[PDB]
Enzyme design. Sequence first.
Site, PDB file in Angstrom:
ATOM      1  N   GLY A 114     -11.687  -8.176   1.191  1.00 36.34           N
ATOM      2  CA  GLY A 114     -10.494  -8.318   2.000  1.00 36.34           C
ATOM      3  C   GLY A 114     -10.537  -7.402   3.204  1.00 36.34           C
ATOM      4  O   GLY A 114     -10.027  -6.277   3.161  1.00 36.34           O
ATOM      5  N   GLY A 129      -9.127  -6.808   6.250  1.00 32.36           N
ATOM      6  CA  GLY A 129      -8.018  -6.846   7.189  1.00 32.36           C
ATOM      7  C   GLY A 129      -7.858  -5.523   7.906  1.00 32.36           C
ATOM      8  O   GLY A 129      -8.840  -4.847   8.232  1.00 32.36           O
ATOM      9  N   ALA A 130      -6.604  -5.136   8.136  1.00 33.79           N
ATOM     10  CA  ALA A 130      -6.337  -3.867   8.804  1.00 33.79           C
ATOM     11  C   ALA A 130      -6.771  -2.691   7.940  1.00 33.79           C
ATOM     12  O   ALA A 130      -7.441  -1.767   8.417  1.00 33.79           O
ATOM     13  CB  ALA A 130      -4.855  -3.756   9.145  1.00 33.79           C
ATOM     14  N   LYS A 184       5.581   6.333  -3.443  1.00 35.79           N
ATOM     15  CA  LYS A 184       5.305   5.549  -2.244  1.00 35.79           C
ATOM     16  C   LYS A 184       6.353   4.463  -2.022  1.00 35.79           C
ATOM     17  O   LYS A 184       6.638   4.110  -0.871  1.00 35.79           O
ATOM     18  CB  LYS A 184       3.903   4.942  -2.340  1.00 35.79           C
ATOM     19  CG  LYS A 184       3.440   4.170  -1.114  1.00 35.79           C
ATOM     20  CD  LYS A 184       2.521   5.002  -0.237  1.00 35.79           C
ATOM     21  CE  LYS A 184       1.789   4.142   0.790  1.00 35.79           C
ATOM     22  NZ  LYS A 184       2.703   3.564   1.819  1.00 35.79           N
ATOM     23  N   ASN A 195       9.890  -1.159   5.006  1.00 33.30           N
ATOM     24  CA  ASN A 195       9.332  -2.505   5.115  1.00 33.30           C
ATOM     25  C   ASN A 195      10.443  -3.544   5.206  1.00 33.30           C
ATOM     26  O   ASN A 195      10.425  -4.417   6.080  1.00 33.30           O
ATOM     27  CB  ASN A 195       8.417  -2.811   3.928  1.00 33.30           C
ATOM     28  CG  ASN A 195       7.134  -1.994   3.942  1.00 33.30           C
ATOM     29  OD1 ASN A 195       7.124  -0.823   4.327  1.00 33.30           O
ATOM     30  ND2 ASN A 195       6.044  -2.610   3.504  1.00 33.30           N
ATOM     31  N   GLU A 220       4.745  -9.139   0.656  1.00 36.84           N
ATOM     32  CA  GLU A 220       4.428  -8.575  -0.648  1.00 36.84           C
ATOM     33  C   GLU A 220       5.699  -8.226  -1.410  1.00 36.84           C
ATOM     34  O   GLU A 220       5.835  -7.109  -1.919  1.00 36.84           O
ATOM     35  CB  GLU A 220       3.560  -7.332  -0.486  1.00 36.84           C
ATOM     36  CG  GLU A 220       2.203  -7.604   0.119  1.00 36.84           C
ATOM     37  CD  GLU A 220       1.341  -6.361   0.152  1.00 36.84           C
ATOM     38  OE1 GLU A 220       1.749  -5.374   0.797  1.00 36.84           O
ATOM     39  OE2 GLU A 220       0.263  -6.370  -0.471  1.00 36.84           O
TER      40      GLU A 220
END
Lengths: 310, 309
Positions: free
Chosen positions: A8, A10-11, A192, A200, A274
């Site tokens: 994966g 991605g970023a 977290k 988010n 997510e």
Amino acid sequence: QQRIGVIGTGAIGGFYGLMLAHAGHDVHFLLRSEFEAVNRAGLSLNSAVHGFRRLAPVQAYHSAQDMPPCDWLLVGAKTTGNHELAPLIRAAAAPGAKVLLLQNGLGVEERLRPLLPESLHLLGGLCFICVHRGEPGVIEHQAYGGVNLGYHSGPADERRRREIVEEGAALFRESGLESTAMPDLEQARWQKLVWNIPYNGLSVLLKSSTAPLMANADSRSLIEAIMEEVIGAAGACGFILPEGYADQLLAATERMPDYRPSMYHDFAHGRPLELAAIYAAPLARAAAAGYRMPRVEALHQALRFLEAQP
Amino acid sequence: QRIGVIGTGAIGGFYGLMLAHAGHDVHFLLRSEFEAVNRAGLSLNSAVHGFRRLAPVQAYHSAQDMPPCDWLLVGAKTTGNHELAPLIRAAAAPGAKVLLLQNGLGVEERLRPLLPESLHLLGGLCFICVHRGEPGVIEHQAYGGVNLGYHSGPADERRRREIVEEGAALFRESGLESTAMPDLEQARWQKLVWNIPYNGLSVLLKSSTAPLMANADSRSLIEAIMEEVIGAAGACGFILPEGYADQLLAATERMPDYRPSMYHDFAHGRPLELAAIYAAPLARAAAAGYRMPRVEALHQALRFLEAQP
Ligand SMILES: NC(=O)c1ccc[n+]([C@@H]2O[C@H](COP(=O)([O-])OP(=O)(O)OC[C@H]3O[C@@H](n4cnc5c(N)ncnc54)[C@H](OP(=O)(O)O)[C@@H]3O)[C@@H](O)[C@H]2O)c1
Ligand SMILES: NC(=O)c1ccc[n+]([C@@H]2O[C@H](COP(=O)([O-])OP(=O)(O)OC[C@H]3O[C@@H](n4cnc5c(N)ncnc54)[C@H](OP(=O)(O)O)[C@@H]3O)[C@@H](O)[C@H]2O)c1
Ligand SMILES: CC(C)CC(=O)C(=O)O
Ligand SMILES: CC(C)CC(=O)C(=O)O
């Protein structure tokens, strides 16, 4: 010295994979939409911390079975497709490989574990970083970048688990990134969430980056109230966070540069949010403890509504 | 029985027109759309009653030009009492009845210090879907009933019931449903069970009633908010009827797709009625020691949105 696989790219996967390669590690990238572009053009990183970084040629792969067996597998995919994720990991894993989920949320390791052979170590990597896919093949790193690792499951005993987490942390530290071994992966995932749940969701809901959210007195008070809910839910589930932890996180976010959280970029590009790992799983765990999170519950419902609208 | 309308918008235009269509002498005070209304008149497109037209209409641009009215139907928004109060006084006959066709909580009490104590201050709870379409046009989609309640004024216990009954009779005369309420505070809390979730979520989720009701998540959120308002009303001494949430949901299911008044305000750039619809119930619940976390959070989100460029 270590053969790294990135499942994966991605970023997150692109950033940490690139940083490790620049430290002299043998890194192999599994890519999805951008395989062709990254295979030819390469990987490039714009970073306010590390300056411009480029890797060319990149050891890029569109099929996981093409990858050589890797000692560490850095999973940079989202938490949204676990059954699509598992076959790739087993293919690229050397005997006894370490699988590190560079993923947000709660309960993510436990949910992936049934599909991973017991010979594989499963670790969680909590990344405190501002980073996003900016341009095709280009990674925009705005701030931070530290990764904290915790061991979830695998054939290691307690001493070997600490050695493996320390080995993982040292890999990133050798790359110029901050890294610490966490004693309790589950406790760290709860900590977290105290940041990811309010920022988010409110970034998507209020169509705002971090600076306007902290500047306005009502959004700032709403953020703090949501933080208290997550901290209370963590406490109700057996994890008591440090004293005045909401104020510490609020203060550090004020010092953050203007930033659009990962979930904001997901919503703008129409990608799945997510919500399952970041909202549904904490809400379900708190419900099992009989602990209500009204603001988080309402925020999750609004996020699901927004995802479903044309 | 000279009737005046202070704030001839969707609400003021609708009820003023219905009274006028029933033979009453109604005088409409207008602001932005006076010149439009002064020429075209007032047209009502109602899915419940049908088409009615009032042309010409007695239209005014300043309350000073209005004759003294016995009943003043206030259809203005609650966001500008400093502007609203001198208009009521200028158009009020001696001992006039001021009917606040307005949402929110504490609305009359907030206006009472700016009105003479010789006037009868009443609240009118309007369960109706109405909005202004083109200038001079009133789009009535659903319902329309008004329940009246007495807040303050010189009337004794007997005349308070008679005045509330007299006002209700006016609306029933015009083909509307109208009930005299014994407690205006309880009735305002009842109306809040609808306007708190639907006005705010329509702005916050950029949506109307039909998508909010069709989606399981927003529907559960509406319900959860409703139970907060119900619980807060009970904590303040007003137990609402049982299953009122289900009754409101069923009525909203049979509502055509509707944008609450607050949605129109946000889209047009007008100030949102946050003070009366959220701040006042929250502060009232706070003084009773009852917390409304979802409503508190919705209010904070709305204040954030209103302050953004
Ligand atoms: N600042 C941050 O971005 C940040 C910070 C902390 C934590 N995280 C967490 O890191 C994880 C990834 O976030 P992100 O920002 O990096 O999102 P992202 O830019 O969309 O990267 C996700 C990558 O996973 C790829 N992928 C998914 N399934 C794949 C499959 N079967 N095969 C090959 N590739 C696959 C995706 O391919 P495509 O691009 O082609 O779709 C994408 O490249 C999330 O769990 C997030 O919570 C992100
Ligand atoms: N279906 C509904 O619309 C509905 C239902 C139940 C309750 N309500 C409540 O009824 C009240 C009015 O609703 P509405 O839909 O009729 O809004 P509206 O269409 O905007 O009508 C408001 C009218 O009053 C004027 N006005 C606004 N603020 C004023 C102020 N401080 N002083 C004097 N005039 C003022 C406005 O002038 P301009 O012409 O320049 O805009 C407009 O003519 C609100 O409290 C609302 O929450 C509405
Ligand atoms: C430090 C946070 C901005 C990283 C994160 O968790 C995210 O953007 O999803
Ligand atoms: C009775 C409702 C449909 C009206 C309302 O609350 C509004 O539009 O402000």
